[PDB]
Amino acid sequence: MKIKSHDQITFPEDVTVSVKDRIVTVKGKRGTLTKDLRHLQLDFRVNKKLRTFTAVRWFGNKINNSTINTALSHVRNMITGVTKGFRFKVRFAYAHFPISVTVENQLVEIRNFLGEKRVRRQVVADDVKVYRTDAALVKDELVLEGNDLEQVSREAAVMHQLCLVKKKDIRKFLDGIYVQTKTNIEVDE
Amino acid sequence: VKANYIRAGRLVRILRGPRQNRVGVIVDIVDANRVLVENPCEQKMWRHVQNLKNVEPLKFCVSISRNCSTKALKEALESKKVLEKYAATKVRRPHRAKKAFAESTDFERYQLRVAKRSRAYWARKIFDENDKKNPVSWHKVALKKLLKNAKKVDSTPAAKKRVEKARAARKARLAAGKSKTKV
Amino acid sequence: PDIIVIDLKDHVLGRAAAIVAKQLLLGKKITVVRCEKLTIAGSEIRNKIKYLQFLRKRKLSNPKLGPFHHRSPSDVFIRTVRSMLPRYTKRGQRALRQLVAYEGVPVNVVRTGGRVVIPKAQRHNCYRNERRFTVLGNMCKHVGWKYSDVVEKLEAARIEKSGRHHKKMEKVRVAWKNARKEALKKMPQKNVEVLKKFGL
Amino acid sequence: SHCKFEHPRHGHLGFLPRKRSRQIRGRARSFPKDDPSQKPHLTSFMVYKAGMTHIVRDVDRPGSKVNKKEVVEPVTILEAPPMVVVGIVGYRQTPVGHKTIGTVWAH
RNA sequence: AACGACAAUGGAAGUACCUUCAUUUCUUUUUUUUACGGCCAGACCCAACCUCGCCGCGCAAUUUCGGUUCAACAUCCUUCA
RNA sequence: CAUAAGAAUUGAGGCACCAAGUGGGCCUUCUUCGGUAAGCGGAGCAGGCGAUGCGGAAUGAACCGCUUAGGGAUAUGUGGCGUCAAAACUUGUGGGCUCAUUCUCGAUACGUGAAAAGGGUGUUGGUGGAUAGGGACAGUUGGACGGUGGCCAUGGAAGUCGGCAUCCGCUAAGGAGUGUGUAACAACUCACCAACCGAAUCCACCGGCCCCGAAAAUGGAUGACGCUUAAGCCCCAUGUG
RNA sequence: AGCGACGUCGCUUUUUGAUCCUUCGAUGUCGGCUCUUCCUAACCUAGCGCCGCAGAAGACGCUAAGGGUUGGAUUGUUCACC
RNA sequence: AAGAUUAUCCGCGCAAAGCGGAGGCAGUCCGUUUUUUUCUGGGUCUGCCGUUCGGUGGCAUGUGCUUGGCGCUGCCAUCUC
RNA sequence: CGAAUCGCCACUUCUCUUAUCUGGGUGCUCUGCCCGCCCUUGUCGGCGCCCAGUACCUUCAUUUUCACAAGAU
């Protein structure tokens, strides 16, 4: 056996984080967002109590070394939601057949596809919030936003997968409801 | 909270070699699982190289050069007095005692046991507060039961007439007590 | 030792089995609980395939008589232990007849003691503390295994009362702490009292 | 070797073994499962088969062929009066299934 | 007053039960168990199988850059060399 | 019988009488023939088996060990010491690799599906080149312009369906042009470099362990369990220090 | 795409051969009817990937054996075959 | 099973803490107090006094039902225990 | 008498031919939540905090603690 070791966490600034357990509890502007990690524990060492946290390893295996990054980033992104949130833009896109999506709020209702077939419905999970916006030339547009990209995204990606089609060629297929901007709610501090 | 870092000039515990529990300090880490260790003990620990599996770091870390001499070591680590400091560590008790325990004798033993016996019935239960606290089930209960026997005495079973009869009975126990011992 | 009850929270399955196997063999009625936290290696996939395949067989004419699959977490283990035991030994059988395991934990019985686990059977201790692994209940869930939900409930209760108890002890134990002290260094001196270094 | 054409076998593996079976009083292999929202509700009744005839009632559905028709249909009649409630039972689920916990009486 | 997861009788082994045989027997006799030269084996405790020779060690020395420190310098030596 | 220099043996040798029982073999290291082959056929040597059991190989005529009076006591053999099952659940005193949604990682010699080709950025360790701090490598950033179609086929390509082409300047550099294609121009792009950049990185090889490759009829068998900081595979050790 | 020559290794055994182990003091020859169940190298069905799939239609592949999988005619058949 | 609880009770209450509720009387056999705290008990026999029941009867009523019968409750009273 | 299931425990001792019970939870990331902290703020090093671990009950009332009657029949 060859030493990686295990441990905990890297850091930036204005947002509190757990620093303890498998679980990072990140707290900032937009609240607090927290995740529990499995085998993802790794050479921590606090560099400042409040001001510097890293986890950038001593020895171990190849596979180990990757994770370290993947770990920071994601929790960084825990910070991101907590700070500047996520805002996904989607637009329904269709040409031969018009397509309509509303938002119940608690759930998203999707109409029309190909004359409509089934009604695609997605319940609005927590903090992915959904807006059909339309003025300002907001346009066939859904907006998913909240302070967890992964969720905002997951729900989103899910949506792209909710607008799938089969049988009788991608070379005539396009139409569906596609991701148009995955972002933050804004720039924020 | 993962923390007793090996740091050359760290004091490590010999954990299962025969050479267990002598002491010495890191004079090298020879890599992965091995150490180079040194002491002033006249016979064990010289400069040994020992397996890391077998060692426990003792949370006395000194400064000293990584890879080093006895002579320097002997004195600075003497100066560090960490042996003593380690000596004062509590962990230590039972096992230096263990060696002792092996070699006691009975009487000693009995006393040793007896010490706690002495305390036992004598300084916890005993008294009156903490035995007005938990107390022991019988106490606790006797007290509690006494509230539930405010029930007879005080209360809604019992004792305004029948305990008067109990008074009759009480003497009756004594009437037999007196009689029975009188034969 | 009598009336034995072992706590299987986080214990390496095979090893624990085997270990017990010898124990049973050497003869003693022993008991397991926290059986649901008995452990299986790696992945549920892996655990399933194996079980599935096990479950999958038949005794073709009368499939009702090859192997049965009491899918309790207990039953898994124990049967393993039977497997690790020599079944058809008339002796082992009696041995079996001795052996006790309940899934989960019927409560009242752990309270002044019960601190008991078994050597090698400590799963992290056995498993590399960085290798992946999967949990028994999870398996039994995977093959259904009915009571899991219930079991949960039951567990929560158990903890509570235990906590209740525990708090209570907590109180006494200070008194118990309070056990002298006082005149207690007047242990002897002739013929070498170091009760001071010994237990005091 | 395999036999010359397909079809499927006769009959379904479960009712088997085909017995002159016991306990001929009304085995009920499950029951519905609770909704508190629904008012407590009794969930069955025992009765006696009486016999059959055919009935007339009107058809309709959204777009059936025979919508808008009067229809005549076979029906059963089952003799019925009341059962009288005589006890209350609690089985409790134990991680080993239902075990009766208590029974409550007629007087 | 014999027994049974289910091969069946089978070996071997010991116990239980036995109907059991034959033998020997105590107020100076038998019986199970301790114990015992020299023996007659096996195991423990310490000594040593030598020795020419490096090895090294020490010193100095060159090359030789490393831990300290925020780093450089000290500290050309942490040290390998 | 010395050499001065070069056997060992020799639990007898010599020597003989006469009668049986046998003539289908079969198995093997080794050599080897026939034929694709074949647990096939067919010879050569030695050994077996046969015609023996014991001890080992979960299972086996011939594989391992070993042969046998009857015992006893001891120690070994092969073979083991996770559990089933005797023995370190080998640690004090020990090393790597290897993780395997496979009907499923694998795992006793003999052994006999040793899948084959043939692959795989699985991992694991070379070798050859490198570039590499006067800056390498990624990631960026800016520019990729000008003397000039230097050009020819060519319906239409001025760099650019196509084909022979190609030097200067400016420079950090920028192709007489990397693509994309307005029929062609254009435009779009970067190859070319500076600037950033700040450390390894870059290529080819390498061969290792590991995986894909990888389909038939009854439920299914590394013996069984299981084991994976192994109870795998491989390694050493039972050892001071 | 889809192929796949030339090669050139695989792989299987519902072929066919080879081999004669066993079987001759006995293991009831064809076919077929029936009937079950099983296998998967999935024909149809569930769902994915490709397409030299626009649609259309097919094709290719995966994942899949849970489910399904014919009447005659002629022909002992088998096979064959309408 | 609930505390390492067998003592005049129960109920309630996690649980605290606490709470409530908890018949009598005389006569009778036997005899302790002790899982470290009864505390007169134990123990039956009777007697004697009273919620409940149990039965008796009646009166209403509710309820429910057949070949107007079957079936059951209220209350009352009685009866008894 | 100089070993000899022995006389106990114990048909109300039994998961078994001879300690009670020391009890509950959790992670490796902690020897007390331990903790907390400081500090060239690191791999830390230092300091601090708390009682808490410092596993752990063996029954005369002792045997903190004098001590005493009684084996042999």
Swiss-Prot record, chain B:
GO terms for cellular component: cytosolic large ribosomal subunit. Keywords: Ribonucleoprotein, Ribosomal protein. Gene3D superfamilies: 2.30.30.30. GO terms for molecular function: RNA binding; structural constituent of ribosome. CDD domains: KOW_RPL14 (cd06088). GO terms for biological process: ribosomal large subunit biogenesis; translation. Belongs to the eukaryotic ribosomal protein eL14 family. Component of the large ribosomal subunit. The ribosome is a large ribonucleoprotein complex responsible for the synthesis of proteins in the cell. This is Large ribosomal subunit protein eL14. It comes from Trypanosoma brucei brucei. The lineage of its organism: Eukaryota, Discoba, Euglenozoa, Kinetoplastea, Metakinetoplastina.
